[PDB]
Amino acid sequence: GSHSCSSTQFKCNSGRCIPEHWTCDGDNDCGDYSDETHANCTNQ
Ligand SMILES: [Ca+2]
User: Fold this and answer.
1) Euclidean distance between the first and the last CA atom of the chain, given in angstroms as a whole number
2) What range(s) does the LDL-receptor class A domain occupy?
3) CA of 14: how far to CAs of 3, 17, 19, 21, 35, in Å?
4) Is 36 among the annotated ligand-binding positions?
């Protein structure tokens, strides 16, 4: 599809896509730490 990421993915600030369940999980999956920010943790 023309969308950036799939329906089950989290969109990193860099534009990289990662599985949504990978947010606030202890690993910097995005590489830019956007999936591990305090903000995303409070959304869990
Ligand atoms: Ca992570």
Assistant:
1) 27
2) 3-43
3) 15, 9, 15, 18, 11
4) yes
Name the region of 38 (left: φ>0; alpha: ψ -120 to 50; beta: rest): alpha
Annotated binding residue at 20?
Answer: no
- For the chain, domains (ranges, CATH) are 1-44 (4.10.400.10)
Contact 9, 28 (CB under 8 A): no
Q: How was this structure determined?
A: X-ray
C-alpha of residue 10 to centroid of ligand 1, in Å: 10
What are phi and psi for residue 9, nearest 5 degrees? Answer: -120, 150
Q: Quick one: resolution in A?
A: 1.9
